[PDB]
Amino acid sequence: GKRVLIVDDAAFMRMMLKDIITKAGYEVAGEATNGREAVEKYKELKPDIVTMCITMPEMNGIDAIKEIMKIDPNAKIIVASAMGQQAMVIEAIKAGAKDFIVKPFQPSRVVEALNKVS
């Protein structure tokens, strides 16, 4: 399965990540702009992979990860963050995330994460 749900409050970031993901032969199944929409779209779409920004309004990334893991204990979540958020990324990993990618996105690394988690 190669359907990805992209979760990030920044349109810019969703666009750049989508470009990488599609260029790598994956499909973007949907987009969400905060944690609450992430959970709703996960239920709606049942994506193979979720990319999840840590820093987000209305519901942050770690809380959304916890919700999605309850909904689907087999979820595959890659956390996204800027540098300097290592402690938050570790917390997200302990809550169930399988890998991480750092902004600004390095295409080779994102591709590697997608293949690995698949």
Curated annotation (Swiss-Prot):
Cofactor: how and how many bound: Binds 1 Mg(2+) ion per subunit.
Q: Does the keyword Metal-binding apply?
A: yes
| Pfam families reported in the protein's UniProt record | Response_reg
- Location of this chain's protein in the cell: Cytoplasm
Q: Which GO terms describe its biological process?
A: archaeal or bacterial-type flagellum-dependent cell motility; chemotaxis; phosphorelay signal transduction system
Residues that coordinate or bind Mg(2+): D8, D9, C53, T55
Superkingdom: Bacteria
Sequence ranges assigned to domain Response regulatory in this UniProt record: 3-118
For the modification 4-aspartylphosphate, the affected residues are C53
SUPFAM superfamilies from the UniProt entry: CheY-like (SSF52172)
Required cofactor names: Mg(2+)
PANTHER family attached to this UniProt entry: TWO-COMPONENT RESPONSE REGULATOR, TWO-COMPONENT RESPONSE REGULATOR ARR22
* The protein's name in its UniProt record: Chemotaxis protein CheY
Which source organism does the UniProt entry give? Answer: Thermotoga maritima (strain ATCC 43589 / DSM 3109 / JCM 10099 / NBRC 100826 / MSB8)
Its taxonomic path starts at: Bacteria, Thermotogati, Thermotogota, Thermotogae, Thermotogales
